[PDB]
Point group: D3
């Protein structure tokens, strides 16, 4: 059976992310959302918060599971029984970054990457910008899953 890994920091997961999960889940036998926390401790939500938000936001996808990633995505793919990497693209910047990483990943491990285009309505949505706006008092609730909104409302006070 085929399997797609969707790696990312998901800090926090957005509706753009969930859209990608849904589209991967419709095409692959199983999907694994791999949460990679960047070495620099400066992130809004801790690993367990990130995991819980993704799980709670994907209860409608029975063939998806959430796991913490360690090391190279390609090692996660090969060791943990997947067949491909799936990532979303919003912009030309995403494309350039992801193209480089995909070619590097194919080179080092023979692992393929498939990209999907953002839904137009979420094209401007990013975890970073949503966090920045939320912290300055802006309403980003329409851009994030309810389980994230619930936690953002508590975290801001």
């Amino acid at each position: 059976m085929t399997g797609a890994v969707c790696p990312g920091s998901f800090d926090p997961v957005t509706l753009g992310h969930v859209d990608i999960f849904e589209r991967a889940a419709a095409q692959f036998d199983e999907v694994v959302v791999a949460i990679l926390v960047n070495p620099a401790k400066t992130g809004m939500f801790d690993l367990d918060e990130r995991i819980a938000m993704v799980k709670e936001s994907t209860t409608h996808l029975p063939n998806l599971r959430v796991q913490v990633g360690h090391g190279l995505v390609v090692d996660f793919v090969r060791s943990c029984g997947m067949t491909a990497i799936v990532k979303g693209l919003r912009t030309g910047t995403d494309f350039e970054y992801e193209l480089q990483m995909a070619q590097m990943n194919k080179h080092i491990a023979g692992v393929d990457t498939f990209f999907v285009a953002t839904a137009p309505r979420y094209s401007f949505v990013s975890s970073s910008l949503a966090k920045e706006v939320a912290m300055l008092g802006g309403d980003v609730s329409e851009l994030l899953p309810e389980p994230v909104n619930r936690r953002l409302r508590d975290r801001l006070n």
Copy 2:
């Protein structure tokens, strides 16, 4: 079972194209290469030549078949039993063009598109440029499948 359509004009098919076919075929149960001939009669090879070149260049992919496309790709996908569209991206220009078409296709029919990154060695390869160079006496044989080279050698004299 899942099924990917890889639409294009393939005039002629290149090693970049075959690379995409191979990568789709490894991920989807079946692949259909859909040849769409553009209304303007100005193309190098006729439909039957295009079909034959793709077939001859993909004998190593048992789960791939070649068909002529008519009308919207999304109608081909829905009527003819596929589940997704697969396209390759070499450049920022490809990305912008393909992003627009993918969003349009999702809007009109709910059909998803997955993109794959060009292999680095074929990033500069296009049917148009290969044809243009070949017609001016340049050697493009390393960029095209042997069945195409064989036919290009005959067509040039």
Copy 3:
């Protein structure tokens, strides 16, 4: 009083276009939609059809009028009592094209151009793609104003 010209071919006008008109009309005392028909006779709707579709789609904008353009946009701006040009940007390609034309226009006539970002939901909408999809039997009615849909329904049969 300030005045913005929104030049384009509008063949046909889309909801993306109307969105730009609305945003210009909210900022400038008056707006003039200038229809420029390209020398090559290959366009879907004739000048009068184009004019009527824009008028019918902008009845809610009392400070907007529709006119046919001739020659340089900058001459239309200076002679016909406007103060600026307003154009929409969807993509990096639009940006590069429009940047060049804006700098050229500032150079030759001192006329400024202001750009507005596409609404995310219409980012993939273009007259060309909508026409192409419609002619192949695709449903683009959610992307175009009703006065355009009405005429497209008649033109297709």
Copy 4:
């Protein structure tokens, strides 16, 4: 009356910036340059220096005033009596960044953003690069207003 906010860090203000101010001031009843100092204390000039440099560089624009910004630009716009945001674009990178922020700003507050193209002669001018060159002994005086040059000459020794 219409009003444009031109937000930025202006550390320091450049001739590219002043060019944008001039073009906004010619189109809007009033302009407010909103200085936003980024949380990280690593900036060349303190808030008061930044304010003074902009004021001194815009004495020829009677309808412009300088203010310090706090929080979301869109809140500054709505509370402080403006109608729009105006920003300059030099490059594709600026376009992608500003497009995202404009769509986010329209989403959260309904506030429009208008972009203007850089003057060709200042396209390569940025506060960061000018500061970096100046600190290594390069002559950037033709890229910055005299009030900035005067202060840069003192700051370097």
Copy 5:
């Protein structure tokens, strides 16, 4: 001795082009401007006009000569005693196009291409846009060499 070919259609040559010639001529022992006329007869100036305009605009560059090109640029380079191709880049679009052609040229013939960045003041200048503006009555004389202006003034009436 080193030699650079600067291929193009030069219809007509602009000040942007001359800027590139000057910069190549300062770096290479000799420069050859190779005029390639595109198969489609739709160009403003005939080959001899193009040749004359370049010659007349480069009298200050003793190490430059003008020639008509036939076939692949790389064949002109190898047969006619040059060592490299030199081309200018204004935009991201130029970069993508020229990158592809350079990689193709290196592949087929081992010939290197060096790119130079446009001067900021000519970044928006192109033969096509200048011709289009001139034909609509716009003043482009500051963008073109005097020998071109002289001929454009005669051609317009």
Copy 6:
């Protein structure tokens, strides 16, 4: 005699870098690789390691020498007897960054920059990504010169 400076951090030098050196060395009388270490102490290899890796990787280029850079590249060019700067471009991002720096460098010192396109096979290779992959246990030996591989093998344990 002509002379090209190829500035960079080379931390570490990659096969992409060596490719550029080779292509510069074939066109200019001499080449100087100028190693610029960024103020932030966070780099993998110290200056002397960087110098040694470049020297050891370029023994086949008799007209190339390696030096440490201080201050503006343009001062190194003018004082140290070079005539031009040479840099490689892989991506649209490189192009935008390098275009800005080249225009700034021409403005402040009259020094020209020539760009060369990446070899397709190294387009995705960067020092940063190679280091990141290597530190996570990925095999990047095909992307780096043997003298770098030898040192990377020791540094990882």
